[PDB]
Design an enzyme around this catalytic site. Structure first.
Site, PDB file in Angstrom:
ATOM      1  N   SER A 179     -16.185  15.119 -84.168  1.00 28.78           N
ATOM      2  CA  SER A 179     -15.016  14.622 -84.242  1.00 28.78           C
ATOM      3  C   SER A 179     -13.658  13.717 -83.698  1.00 28.78           C
ATOM      4  O   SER A 179     -13.793  14.365 -82.276  1.00 28.78           O
ATOM      5  CB  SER A 179     -14.446  15.630 -84.888  1.00 28.78           C
ATOM      6  OG  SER A 179     -13.157  14.938 -85.976  1.00 28.78           O
ATOM      7  N   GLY A 180     -13.572  12.358 -83.820  1.00 26.37           N
ATOM      8  CA  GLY A 180     -12.846  11.949 -83.187  1.00 26.37           C
ATOM      9  C   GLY A 180     -14.095  10.777 -82.521  1.00 26.37           C
ATOM     10  O   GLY A 180     -13.066  10.240 -81.381  1.00 26.37           O
ATOM     11  N   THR A 184     -16.245   6.111 -87.569  1.00 26.46           N
ATOM     12  CA  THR A 184     -15.495   5.226 -88.737  1.00 26.46           C
ATOM     13  C   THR A 184     -15.076   4.426 -88.437  1.00 26.46           C
ATOM     14  O   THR A 184     -15.198   3.559 -88.821  1.00 26.46           O
ATOM     15  CB  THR A 184     -14.294   6.298 -89.617  1.00 26.46           C
ATOM     16  OG1 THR A 184     -14.617   7.570 -89.783  1.00 26.46           O
ATOM     17  CG2 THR A 184     -13.783   5.499 -89.972  1.00 26.46           C
ATOM     18  N   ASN A 224      -8.783  15.641 -84.175  1.00 19.37           N
ATOM     19  CA  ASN A 224      -8.669  13.703 -85.083  1.00 19.37           C
ATOM     20  C   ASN A 224      -7.915  13.243 -85.967  1.00 19.37           C
ATOM     21  O   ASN A 224      -8.027  14.230 -86.913  1.00 19.37           O
ATOM     22  CB  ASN A 224     -10.053  13.200 -85.967  1.00 19.37           C
ATOM     23  CG  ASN A 224     -10.524  11.568 -85.565  1.00 19.37           C
ATOM     24  OD1 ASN A 224      -8.874  10.608 -85.688  1.00 19.37           O
ATOM     25  ND2 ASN A 224     -10.809  11.512 -86.302  1.00 19.37           N
ATOM     26  N   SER A 227      -9.671  11.653 -89.786  1.00 13.91           N
ATOM     27  CA  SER A 227     -10.488  12.584 -90.302  1.00 13.91           C
ATOM     28  C   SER A 227     -11.049  12.260 -90.928  1.00 13.91           C
ATOM     29  O   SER A 227     -10.840  12.300 -92.213  1.00 13.91           O
ATOM     30  CB  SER A 227     -10.446  14.043 -89.690  1.00 13.91           C
ATOM     31  OG  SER A 227     -11.884  14.632 -89.958  1.00 13.91           O
ATOM     32  N   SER A 228     -12.418  11.764 -91.744  1.00 12.80           N
ATOM     33  CA  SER A 228     -13.180  12.002 -92.295  1.00 12.80           C
ATOM     34  C   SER A 228     -13.356  13.066 -92.834  1.00 12.80           C
ATOM     35  O   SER A 228     -14.250  13.281 -92.192  1.00 12.80           O
ATOM     36  CB  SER A 228     -14.585  10.880 -92.069  1.00 12.80           C
ATOM     37  OG  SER A 228     -14.261   9.543 -91.553  1.00 12.80           O
ATOM     38  N   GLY A 450     -18.030  14.101 -88.641  1.00 16.15           N
ATOM     39  CA  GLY A 450     -18.817  14.529 -87.130  1.00 16.15           C
ATOM     40  C   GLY A 450     -18.274  16.134 -86.773  1.00 16.15           C
ATOM     41  O   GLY A 450     -17.760  16.302 -86.962  1.00 16.15           O
ATOM     42  N   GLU A 452     -17.099  19.824 -85.270  1.00 18.48           N
ATOM     43  CA  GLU A 452     -16.349  20.086 -84.950  1.00 18.48           C
ATOM     44  C   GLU A 452     -15.674  21.212 -84.505  1.00 18.48           C
ATOM     45  O   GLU A 452     -16.834  22.330 -85.713  1.00 18.48           O
ATOM     46  CB  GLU A 452     -14.881  20.002 -86.192  1.00 18.48           C
ATOM     47  CG  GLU A 452     -15.242  20.128 -87.589  1.00 18.48           C
ATOM     48  CD  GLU A 452     -14.334  19.642 -88.944  1.00 18.48           C
ATOM     49  OE1 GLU A 452     -13.469  18.479 -88.425  1.00 18.48           O
ATOM     50  OE2 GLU A 452     -14.215  20.085 -89.592  1.00 18.48           O
TER      51      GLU A 452
HETATM   52  N1  LIG Z   1     -13.643   0.990 -81.215  1.00 23.21           N
HETATM   53  C1  LIG Z   1     -12.368   1.759 -81.177  1.00 23.21           C
HETATM   54  N2  LIG Z   1     -11.522   1.236 -80.736  1.00 23.21           N
HETATM   55  C2  LIG Z   1     -10.147   1.773 -80.300  1.00 23.21           C
HETATM   56  N3  LIG Z   1      -9.448   3.018 -80.830  1.00 23.21           N
HETATM   57  C3  LIG Z   1     -10.462   3.736 -80.847  1.00 23.21           C
HETATM   58  C4  LIG Z   1     -11.927   2.762 -81.290  1.00 23.21           C
HETATM   59  N4  LIG Z   1     -12.942   3.868 -81.914  1.00 23.21           N
HETATM   60  C5  LIG Z   1     -12.236   4.880 -82.082  1.00 23.21           C
HETATM   61  N5  LIG Z   1     -11.089   4.402 -82.121  1.00 23.21           N
HETATM   62  C6  LIG Z   1      -9.573   5.475 -81.648  1.00 23.21           C
HETATM   63  O1  LIG Z   1      -9.818   6.904 -82.006  1.00 23.21           O
HETATM   64  C7  LIG Z   1     -10.014   7.001 -83.587  1.00 23.21           C
HETATM   65  C8  LIG Z   1     -10.724   7.950 -84.557  1.00 23.21           C
HETATM   66  O2  LIG Z   1     -11.952   7.260 -84.743  1.00 23.21           O
HETATM   67  P1  LIG Z   1     -12.979   7.312 -86.030  1.00 23.21           P
HETATM   68  O3  LIG Z   1     -14.034   6.715 -86.486  1.00 23.21           O
HETATM   69  O4  LIG Z   1     -12.139   7.493 -87.403  1.00 23.21           O
HETATM   70  O5  LIG Z   1     -13.687   9.160 -85.043  1.00 23.21           O
HETATM   71  P2  LIG Z   1     -14.720   9.487 -86.250  1.00 23.21           P
HETATM   72  O6  LIG Z   1     -15.836   9.311 -85.667  1.00 23.21           O
HETATM   73  O7  LIG Z   1     -14.234  11.165 -86.244  1.00 23.21           O
HETATM   74  O8  LIG Z   1     -14.085   8.929 -87.731  1.00 23.21           O
HETATM   75  C9  LIG Z   1      -8.884   5.927 -84.210  1.00 23.21           C
HETATM   76  O9  LIG Z   1      -8.831   6.318 -85.542  1.00 23.21           O
HETATM   77  C10 LIG Z   1      -8.793   5.021 -82.737  1.00 23.21           C
HETATM   78  O10 LIG Z   1      -7.602   6.204 -82.432  1.00 23.21           O
HETATM   79  O1  VO4 Z   2     -13.629  13.430 -87.571  1.00 21.09           O
HETATM   80  V1  VO4 Z   2     -14.802  12.998 -87.747  1.00 21.09           V
HETATM   81  O2  VO4 Z   2     -15.747  13.413 -86.874  1.00 21.09           O
HETATM   82  O3  VO4 Z   2     -15.505  14.156 -88.894  1.00 21.09           O
HETATM   83  O4  VO4 Z   2     -15.294  11.243 -88.878  1.00 21.09           O
HETATM   84 MG   LIG Z   3     -14.694   9.284 -89.279  1.00 21.57          MG
END
Ligand SMILES: Nc1ncnc2c1ncn2[C@@H]1O[C@H](COP(=O)(O)OP(=O)(O)O)[C@@H](O)[C@H]1O
Ligand code: VO4
Ligand SMILES: [Mg+2]
Ligand SMILES: Cc1cc2c(s1)N=C1N(c3ccc(N4CCOCC4)cc3)CC[C@@]1(O)C2=O
Lengths: 767, 155
Positions: A179-180, A184, A224, A227-228, A450, A452
């Site tokens: 997670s985070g 996404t 996160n 979070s998705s 992801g 968690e």
């Molecule tokens: N490539 C990136 N560039 C900048 N910030 C990023 C990037 N990937 C992730 N982040 C930071 O991490 C946060 C969570 O990423 P996200 O992909 O939503 O996590 P998850 O894998 O849980 O979806 C984003 O909203 C941003 O703050």
């Molecule tokens: O915050 V996530 O790892 O469920 O996308």
């Molecule tokens: Mg996500």
């Protein structure tokens, strides 16, 4: 080549180090026997210079000036300065934990977040926006081979596209992480890449599909802020030539429970807070609500605001996505109105009748607002909740309901409306994305919730963490099993190796018949079953019989040792969570609603977990029929701090992901393979005289002759039946020679042109 | 360096090269400016790059090219060194180089694509020089048979 990197623009320093730094690294002195990594209690591993070696121990002085002494088994060889910030870690002379750790660390310190690891890519979250995703960068990555450009999510996307055309095969881009980690964000960048290359066009609509679904399916969690809470598989369809034809989104189970329940440090879905942010005051008026979330029981059990989120600006993004997606004016209103009705349902009060357990409304003001928003008669709604029908064709025979039963049914209905609306929005987006164009192949991008670990882990966390285990095992099977079989299939000499990367022990425990889901599903079919009888059955056939099933020592009921850590689960209400019963009398009113969208939402397995397992099994089966491309996301720290890296956290992730094991198979194997016809076509340039036109030699023979005629290490390639297999780095060398040869031939063609013109001018002088 | 070059050209060849060299003399001093050296090396059958021409002249500045002059006796070993430096480029090597710009399948690159390559890549050629090479090369629609183009420049 600082001139070659000028095509990337402002992103160049964030993708590749300067030519000056590269030249400084090449000329930096290095004593191989004294430059070492040493194991450290505080930092895990540190760089150090050996001062003395004696009696089996090594005394070294660290970068920080500290003197340290370890046994010779805790000293690792350092790679020379030319390997600093290497783009592919499979190319290092020495591959061990400190080498991979420090390469990722040093690249991350220069804000270079992508790094190759043989056949796959690793990315460490920067927690800051870098200018590496501009339209200029998308342009610069188009058509480039993996060796021709710096590591980036765009290169993985483009490479997948190339494989799709050359092998005439469907591809999939699987993005890993807890997670985070960044799944996404990287999914949205893959979508951005393919799309770039009033109601909008297919390209604008593919891009806008995410912000809409994120408003309704993403929520703030302890790990996160965005979070998705649903998984998605986006297929991007291409025609025979390679033109973007269509797209579709498939979503898996939405975490419905979040609509009516939140832990202390988390919020419900973004949409509630976006609406109440008052950016669009007309929405507040339309929904008959206030701007204070505390006024709504279902969505105010945890947090209300998130420092990193501007709920006003995000409402504009959600509303704008609805516009680009082409939802009708009535559809847009119905989306907001149904959301408002969900909020109101939580505030409905009920009380027992005097001398009875039967429920009756405790006031009707809230019910009046919810029924208005749903185009229902509020008296009919309240009567259906308190007195539901026993039989279909008879409205006189009704069963009573206690106050707790009514509250539970109200919760179930609010979740069903929300979830069905979420699924209907996906259906609608898919109708817009279906251009009806002819399609030959696709590239799927997988974005699951992801791994968690929370203070409280329920059935939702078990399914999420199991999905992650299944996906890690998919990476393990592809990298360490199918890859070795691929060598045997092509006739390459190969002796099988057991990498010991197999999560079958935990997977069997969860999904085998008589496993955790099987026991849960079995207990769901007994009306006398309780949380304790379920806990007892789990203990009776799994405790002390499976090493991955443990009791928590220091509350939780059982612990599972997952690939990414031991998780303590609590089985409270799992039997209730696994069944999806609705008040059918209320459903009848929704079906008769004047609100066409609500009527549509309500117009095959025995439990929710069985449906979950089937969605998961269907996904894994589908992925088997594609060529996967893995992106491993890594969080550098647990505080969302840009640039900071906790060494043990990173090492933990590298270990459970099997990053070093994966690099080892790419170093032992042949991570690059080219079809003979495609090889001959691309690399004839290197030595055209080796394959003269007058001979009618086949593709395979021409490739043999060509490779045998150039200055290349002849042990770095092997001939398969249909493809030439290369050891890591040989394609980079062939690509580098190709770039040099093409540059020389242009100047030599120009020299011929100059000669030609000088000789025609000389001919005129003679006459 | 030039003193170390051994002359291999026959007596007959040397006399013909002197006659050709003197056609370039624009002032009657039996000398040519360094800027004309490339044209004379090429007139005599060599295909040096502007870099190779600059290298034989002892890498002179852009001003020294227009102002400094050279006698046949000093040009002769330069021609020998260029001739010895056998301008390796075979017919098939050139068509493979141009084949890269195919875009389509057939053996034909587009008109303005070949112009852009010759005028912007490698040793950038003048716009007017590129136009002279396109001496009835573009077919209708605006395409050039690159295989035929290579034969044309090599003729
Ligand atoms: N490539 C990136 N560039 C900048 N910030 C990023 C990037 N990937 C992730 N982040 C930071 O991490 C946060 C969570 O990423 P996200 O992909 O939503 O996590 P998850 O894998 O849980 O979806 C984003 O909203 C941003 O703050
Ligand atoms: O915050 V996530 O790892 O469920 O996308
Ligand atoms: Mg996500
Ligand atoms: C290929 C799949 C991907 C995937 C799946 S499947 N599943 C998911 N999630 C979920 C699963 C089960 C339950 N339930 C099961 C029944 O008892 C309550 C919790 C709720 C949500 C939430 C996140 C999720 O969409 C995901 O990422």
């Amino acid at each position: 080549k600082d001139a070659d990197m000028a095509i990337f623009g402002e992103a160049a320093p964030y993708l590749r180090k300067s030519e000056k730094e590269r030249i400084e690294a090449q000329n930096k002195p290095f004593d191989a026997k004294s430059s070492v990594f040493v194991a450290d209690p505080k930092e895990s591993f540190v760089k150090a210079t050996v001062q003395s070696r004696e009696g089996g121990k090594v005394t070294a002085k660290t970068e920080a000036g500290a003197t340290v002494t370890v046994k010779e088994d805790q000293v690792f060889p350092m790679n020379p300065p030319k390997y600093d910030k290497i783009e592919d870690m499979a190319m290092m002379t020495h591959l061990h934990e400190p080498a991979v750790l420090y390469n990722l660390k040093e690249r991350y310190a220069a804000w270079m977040i992508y790094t190759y690891s043989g056949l796959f890519c690793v990315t460490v979250n920067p927690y800051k926006w870098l200018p590496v995703y501009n339209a200029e960068v998308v342009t610069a990555y188009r058509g480039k081979k993996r060796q021709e450009a710096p590591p980036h999510i765009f290169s993985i996307s483009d490479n997948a596209y190339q494989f799709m055309l050359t092998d005439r095969e469907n591809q999939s881009i699987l993005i890993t992480g807890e997670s985070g980690a960044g799944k996404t964000v990287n999914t949205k960048r893959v979508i951005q890449y393919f799309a770039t290359i009033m109601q909008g066009t297919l390209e604008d609509q593919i891009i806008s599909a995410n912000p809409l679904l994120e408003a309704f399916a993403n929520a703030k969690t302890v790990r996160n802020d965005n979070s998705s809470r649903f998984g998605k598989f986006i297929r991007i369809h291409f025609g025979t030539t390679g033109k973007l034809a269509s797209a579709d989104i498939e979503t898996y189970l939405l975490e419905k429970s979040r609509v009516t329940f939140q832990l202390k440090a988390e919020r419900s879905y973004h949409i509630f807070y976006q609406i109440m942010s008052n950016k669009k005051p007309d929405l507040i008026e339309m929904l008959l609500i206030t701007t204070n979330p505390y006024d709504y029981a279902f969505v105010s059990q945890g947090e209300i605001t998130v420092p990193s989120i501007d709920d006003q600006e995000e409402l504009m993004a959600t509303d704008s996505a609805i516009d680009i997606l082409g939802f009708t004016s009535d559809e847009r209103v119905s989306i907001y109105k149904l959301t408002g009705a969900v909020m109101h349902y939580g505030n409905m009060k009920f009380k027992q009748k005097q001398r009875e357990e039967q429920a009756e409304p405790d006031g009707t003001e809230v019910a009046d607002k919810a029924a208005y928003l749903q185009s229902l008669n509020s008296x009919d709604l309240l009567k259906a909740l308190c007195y539901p029908r026993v039989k279909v064709g008879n409205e006189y025979v009704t069963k009573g309901q206690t106050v707790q039963q009514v509250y539970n049914s109200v919760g179930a209905l609010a979740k069903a409306v929300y979830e069905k609306m979420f699924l209907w929005m996906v259906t609608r987006i898919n109708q817009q994305l279906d251009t009806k164009q002819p399609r030959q192949y696709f590239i799927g991008v997988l974005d699951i919730a992801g791994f968690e670990i929370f203070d409280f882990n329920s059935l939702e966390q078990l399914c999420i963490n199991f999905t992650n285990e299944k996906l890690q095992q998919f990476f393990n099977h592809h990298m360490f099993v199918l890859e070795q079989e691929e060598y045997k299939k092509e006739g390459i000499e190969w002796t099988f190796i057991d990498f010991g990367m197999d999560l079958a022990a935990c997977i069997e425990l969860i999904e085998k018949p008589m496993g955790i889901f099987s026991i849960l599903e079995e207990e769901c079919m007994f009306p006398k079953a309780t949380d304790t009888s379920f806990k007892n059955k789990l203990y009776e056939q799994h405790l002390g019989k499976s090493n991955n099933f443990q009791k928590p020592k220091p509350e939780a009921h059982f612990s599972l040792v997952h690939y990414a850590g031991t998780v303590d689960y609590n089985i409270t209400g799992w039997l209730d969570k696994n069944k999806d019963p609705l008040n059918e009398t209320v459903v009848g009113l929704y079906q008769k609603s004047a609100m066409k969208t609500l009527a549509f939402l309500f117009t095959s397995f025995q439990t929710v977990s069985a449906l979950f397992r089937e969605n998961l099994n269907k996904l894994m089966t589908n992925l088997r029929s594609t060529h996967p491309h893995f992106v491993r996301c890594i969080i550098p720290n647990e505080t969302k701090t840009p640039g900071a890296m906790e060494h043990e956290l990173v090492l933990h992730q590298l270990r459970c992901n099997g990053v070093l094991e994966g690099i080892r198979i790419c170093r032992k194997g042949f991570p690059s393979r080219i079809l003979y016809a495609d090889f001959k076509q691309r690399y004839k340039v290197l030595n055209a005289s080796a394959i003269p036109e007058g001979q009618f030699i086949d593709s395979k023979k021409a490739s043999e002759k060509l490779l045998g005629s150039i200055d290349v290490d002849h042990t770095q390639y092997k001939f398969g039946h249909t493809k030439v297999f290369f050891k890591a780095g040989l394609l980079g060398l062939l690509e580098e020679m190709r770039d040099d040869k093409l540059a020389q031939l242009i100047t030599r063609t120009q020299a011929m042109c100059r000669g030609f013109l000088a000789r025609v001018e000389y001919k005129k002088m003679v006459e | 360096d030039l003193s170390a070059i051994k002359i291999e050209f026959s007596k007959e060849q040397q006399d013909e090269f002197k006659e050709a060299f003197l056609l370039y003399d624009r002032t009657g001093d039996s000398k040519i400016t360094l800027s004309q050296v490339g044209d004379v090396l090429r007139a005599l059958g060599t295909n040096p790059t502007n870099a190779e021409v600059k290298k034989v002249l002892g890498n002179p500045s852009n001003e020294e090219m227009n102002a400094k002059k050279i006698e046949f006796e000093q040009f002769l070993p330069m021609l020998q060194a260029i001739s010895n430096n056998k301008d390796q480029g075979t017919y098939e090597d050139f068509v493979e180089g141009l084949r890269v710009f195919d875009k389509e399948g057939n053996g034909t690159v587009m008109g303005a694509e070949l112009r852009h390559v010759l005028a912007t890549l490698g040793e950038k050629m003048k716009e007017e020089e590129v136009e002279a090479l396109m001496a009835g090369q573009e077919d209708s629609n605006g395409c050039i048979n690159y295989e035929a183009f290579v034969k044309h420049i090599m003729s």
